Structure formats: structure tokens, C-alpha cells
Design a binder for this molecule. Sequence first.
Ligand code: NAG
Ligand code: NAG
Ligand code: NAG
Lengths: 54, 163, 55, 55
Amino acid sequence: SVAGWILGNPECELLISKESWSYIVETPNPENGTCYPGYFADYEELREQLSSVS
Amino acid sequence: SFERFEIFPKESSWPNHTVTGVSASCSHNGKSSFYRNLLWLTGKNGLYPNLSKSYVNNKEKEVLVLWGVHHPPNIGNQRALYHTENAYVSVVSSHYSRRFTPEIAKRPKVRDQEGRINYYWTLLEPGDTIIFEANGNLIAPWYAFALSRGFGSGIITSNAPMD
Amino acid sequence: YVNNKEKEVLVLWGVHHPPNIGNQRALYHTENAYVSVVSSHYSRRFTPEIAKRPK
Amino acid sequence: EKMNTQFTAVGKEFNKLERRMENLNKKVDDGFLDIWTYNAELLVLLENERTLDFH
Ligand SMILES: *[C@@H]1O[C@H](CO)[C@@H](O)[C@H](O)[C@H]1NC(C)=O
Ligand SMILES: *[C@@H]1O[C@H](CO)[C@@H](O)[C@H](O)[C@H]1NC(C)=O
Ligand SMILES: *[C@@H]1O[C@H](CO)[C@@H](O)[C@H](O)[C@H]1NC(C)=O
């Protein structure tokens, strides 16, 4: 998931050299997100802002 | 479904706190009473043992629980019913947590009463857990609500006769 | 930190809430900690919250 | 028959500190109301001449 990968989970290491894009494709049930449990503040706004970068 | 079911029985879940808390602002049929789903907790033998209760949603459907925190208007009343000056409550869950603290200040009179109760609510999931930890000024739940939300609806305000 | 680049930068940080006061004092040697982040138009003061939570 | 229908909600409520939502909700609701008046009306006025000319 976006939060799991942005925070740098030990998994999701295969997608470091994919800097530029047009959009992000997820999995219907993304499992390996954040390891330590918690409440990710302003989650939704982060996804929208990171939906497009150069 | 809206099964209103006992969650924290008043006769067995609070052996060490007085549960008959009444307010003159909610009088019913000429005598003081209180809400019929909440419970004002006070001291006993001049002692208010900090409470720590838990609940597991055994049912196979969402449950809705309410609770509130009481803000006394003066420090004298706060120490009278709780024997402490800086209380704190806490309500944790699997993916939900907050830590409320009381706020004491003089407020304009509303319904011949100054103190304020801030009500809060949440939701659980099948098999989820909710833990109440507090040392004062907690209005614990007494009745929950198991709900079966179906594809949403709307609310109407009107005065038409029932037919 | 000063954003020397000519581009926006995104930074992340977190605050750890221990489950018991014993662990809190073990790794930090204090009972009432506090963290704070500030910028030109951004400032908040987080504080830890200790309580028993479901596993 | 082409008036496809679905469950619809009423304009919700908001507290005094979220007035931006109320005006946004009014703008979208009034936009559809203005659209359907002109769209529906000009259809039965243009297609009333079509049937009159047909006769
Ligand atoms: C990743 O997800 C799998 C299930 O899909 C789980 O068994 C595993 O413990 C997870 N590990 C991490 C590091 O997220
Ligand atoms: C309540 O009081 C009894 C004895 O007065 C004590 O054993 C118990 O630990 C207290 N706390 C409860 C029942 O939560
Ligand atoms: C309750 O308060 C007493 C002292 O007032 C303290 O020793 C005890 O650890 C507290 N228990 C909880 C569960 O906070």
C-alpha cells in the first residue's frame, strides 16, 4: 500500500527505481502495509498529492 | 437491527463505584434522574479506585457504543466527587485511540446548570476490542447499539400526521 | 534542515507510544516526554499517551 | 421510460463551522435543478412541434 511503501517497509523493495510515473496501481487487499500498528494521520491527502509526480 | 442490549451491567461491573448519579437538569415526572443509556460514576467511602474494563464484540455484527466525560465548573466540586485535581480518561481500540482530559472553567448558565458533558461515539468490528481506562470524570456506557447499516438512507423533518 | 533544492520536499516522522510506564522509562529515562516540529507555517507539539491496548 | 431512477439522499446537515460544505452542496444541487428544468422543458417544446407537424 502507499503508506506501507512510503514509510519504507522492509518489503516492497522491488519498486525503488520506478521514480517517474503517471499513476499508481494497487492490489484489492494490500496486506504488507505498515508493520507497527497505528493511525496514519492525513492518509487520504497524502495519496492524492502523491498520485502524480515527475 | 437495533438491538439495545446491556453491555456493562450496573449491578456487577461497578462494585467499587457509586452508580446512582442524578442531575437536577434532567428531571423526569418531578424528580431528578439521568440518561437511560449512560452512567454517572462517583466515589465511595471517599475513595475512587481507577477503573479498567474491557469488551469484546462477540456478535457477528457492528456494535455502537457511547460514552461521555464530565467537566465540573469549579475545582471544589471536582475534588468532591473524584478526590483528585488532574483526572484523565482513555478509550482504546484496535484502530482507534484518544485521551481526554477534563477542563474546568466558569461557563454561562444553561438550563440552570454550568457543567458540561462532552459525548463521544465510535464503532467496532466483529471480534474487535474496546478498553476503557480512566481515573475520574468518566461517564461509562450502560447500553450499546448493535446496528445493521444497509446501503444508507436519508432523514426527514416534518410534522405531518402518522398514517 | 534547510531545503536547499529548488523543489518541494516531503518528510515523515513518527511518535512511539509505549504500552506501559515501565517500558517508557527503560528506553527514555523520563516519564513525561514531548516532541515538537516547526516550520515557516507549520507547528505542532505531540505528547506520548500511555494506555493498555488490544494486541 | 428513459428516466432511470436510483436511491437518492437529501441535502445533509452541517454545523456552523463547516459552512463551505453547505454552499458546495447547494451549488451541486442547484446545478442539477437548473439543468433539468431547461433540458426537460425544451424537450417537450421541441417535440410538441414534431408531433403537431406529424399530424
Ligand atoms: C506480509 O503479509 C503476509 C500475508 O500476505 C504476512 O503473512 C506477513 O507476515 C506480512 N509481513 C510483513 C513484513 O508485512
Ligand atoms: C474492588 O474492591 C475489592 C475489595 O474492596 C478489590 O478486591 C477489587 O480489586 C476492587 N476492584 C475491582 C473489583 O475492580
Ligand atoms: C490507580 O491509582 C493508584 C494510586 O492512586 C496506583 O497505585 C495504581 O497503579 C492505579 N491503577 C491504574 C490501573 O491506573
